[PDB]
Amino acid sequence: MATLLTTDDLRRALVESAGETDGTDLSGDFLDLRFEDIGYDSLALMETAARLESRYGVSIPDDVAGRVDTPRELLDLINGALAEAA
């Protein structure tokens, strides 16, 4: 059945990596947002992915992690790798 990331799962990654709700409101849907729009660098995106990567046992290239403009594609990317697992 696999284990995919919901809006809460990915939200936590962003929030926890940034700190603790530091203006980073990913409450509800945040897929149609942009990382620059929410004050994120790819550096934090690495950290975001890494925290999830470690739990789910996935691995995404740093260059690919720090390439997503929208949180949607970050979710899409990890869920893609999650589907590459079983």
Curated annotation (Swiss-Prot):
GO terms for cellular component: cytosol; membrane. GO terms for biological process: antibiotic biosynthetic process; lipid A biosynthetic process. Pathway: Antibiotic biosynthesis; actinorhodin biosynthesis. Disulfide bonds: none annotated. It comes from the Bacteria. 4'-phosphopantetheine is transferred from CoA to a specific serine of the apo-ACP-like protein. The keyword Cytoplasm does not apply. Keywords: Antibiotic biosynthesis, Phosphopantetheine, Phosphoprotein. Residues 4-82 form the Carrier domain. Pfam families: PP-binding. The modification O-(pantetheine 4'-phosphoryl)serine is found at S42. One of its GO terms (molecular function) is acyl binding. Acyl carrier protein. This is Actinorhodin polyketide synthase acyl carrier protein.
